[PDB]
Amino acid sequence: PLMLDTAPNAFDDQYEGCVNKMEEKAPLLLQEDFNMNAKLKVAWEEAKKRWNNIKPSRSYPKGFNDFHGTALVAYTGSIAVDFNRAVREFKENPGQFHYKAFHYYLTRALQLLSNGDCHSVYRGTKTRFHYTGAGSVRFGQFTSSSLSKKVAQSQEFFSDHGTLFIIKTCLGVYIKEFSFRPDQEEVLIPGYEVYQKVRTQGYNEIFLDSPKRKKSNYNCLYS
Numbered sequence: 113p114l115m116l117d118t119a120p121n122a123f124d125d126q127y128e129g130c131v132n133k134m135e136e137k138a139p140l141l142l143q144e145d146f147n148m149n150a151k152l153k154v155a156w157e158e159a160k161k162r163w164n165n166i167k168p169s170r171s172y173p174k175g176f177n178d179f180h181g182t183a184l185v186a187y188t189g190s191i192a193v194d195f196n197r198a199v200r201e202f203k204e205n206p207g208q209f210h211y212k213a214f215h216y217y218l219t220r221a222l223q224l225l226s227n228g229d230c231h232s233v234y235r236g237t238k239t240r241f242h243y244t245g246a247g248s249v250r251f252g253q254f255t256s257s258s259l260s261k262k263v264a265q266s267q268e269f270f271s272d273h274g275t276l277f278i279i280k281t282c283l284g285v286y287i288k289e290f291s292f293r294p295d296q297e298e299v300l301i302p303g304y305e306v307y308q309k310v311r312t313q314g315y316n317e318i319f320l321d322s323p324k325r326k327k328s329n330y331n332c333l334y335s
Contacts, residue, residue, distance in 0.1 A: 113240045116310070116318070122252020123202035123209060123330055124303045127219060130332035134216050138179070141334060142213035149210035152191055156214075159186035162292055170289065173224045180221035184290035187218055187254065188298060199253040199303065202330075212334045218254065222285050222302055230282035230323070233257035233299045236270030237277070243312045249320060252303040257284065259297040272316065279320045281305060304328050 127134055146153035163181045172181070187195070198209050235257040243249065257279060258264050265276060284301040288294045309322035 113242050116241055116243050116249045118248060118250045118306070119200070119252025119303065120329065121201060121203035122250075122303055123199045123206075123215060123333075124252050124328040125215065125219065125330045125333055126223075126302075126304055126328050127216060127335070128331055130335035131220065133332070133335045134220070137335070138213040138216050142179075142217070145210050145213050151194065152210065152214060155186050155189055155191035156182065159183075159189060159292075163290075166289065176221070176224045179217045180224060181290060183214060183217035184221045184287055184300070185292060186214070187256070187300065188287070188291035188293060188296070192256070196253045196255075200251075216334075219302065221290075222254075222283075222300055225285045225287075226283070228282075230280060231257075231259065231284050231286065231299050233259055233279050233281055233284065233301075234261045234264035235277040235279065236264040236266070236274065238269070238271045238274040240273060240316065241275045241277075241318060243310050243318055245312065247310070248306050248308050249310050250303070250306045250326070251301075254303055255301045256296075257281065257299045257301055259286075259299060263296055274316065276317050277320055278313075278317060279307075280323060282323045283325055 160182045162185045167181055195211055198211055202209055281301050283305040284299040287298050287300045291298055305323050306326040307320035307323050311319040313319060
């Protein structure tokens with residue numbers, strides 16, 4: 113069982129005050145990430161293919177480009193596990209974080225897709241998580257979730273020995289239209305959303321509520 117906390121070791125950059133600086137250096141940084149992360153390079157190429165197939169559909173927020181659309185699609189693919197791990201364990205070994213630009217583009221994609229709506233979502237895990245019974249909770253890493261409780265409890269994500277998270281998110285963005293799998297009814301949640309009302313229910317359910325944006329530990333680190 114893993115303990116929920118405020119994720120002090122997570123890379124949680126919100127890029128406050130350095131967006132323009134990042135948008136100009138990120139292309140070079142992405143190329144570098146690829147040179148240190150072959151899996152990411154392949155993952156990006158696959159997501160670019162998917163993004164190109166779906167983008168003709170609708171229009172997007174001002175400033176939203178191919179790097180943003182591609183980053184979102186990529187997160188809905190297999191690179192998510194390693195990326196989430198890398199972010200979660202950042203402070204423990206920053207020398208091995210080969211997602212400098214990827215993290216920026218995904219964060220920027222979510223921010224550009226921001227309005228003020230909140231969503232009722234669910235996330236199932238195979239690993240059992242325990243809430244200490246008091247205090248706020250934060251994941252640090254981006255996390256996925258689904259509008260569908262059925263998706264969250266599907267064999268892909270959930271086990272009775274694991275945990276089902278019932279979440280009210282207000283910073284999450286609905287990304288069904290930026291995914292390899294629309295059917296997953298995915299809502300992407302930034303790692304800087306903090307849940308101030310947390311409750312253990314039964315033996316494998318945890319409720320995360322009263323979400324709020326909270327200033328991050330890292331800011332414009334690679335700017």
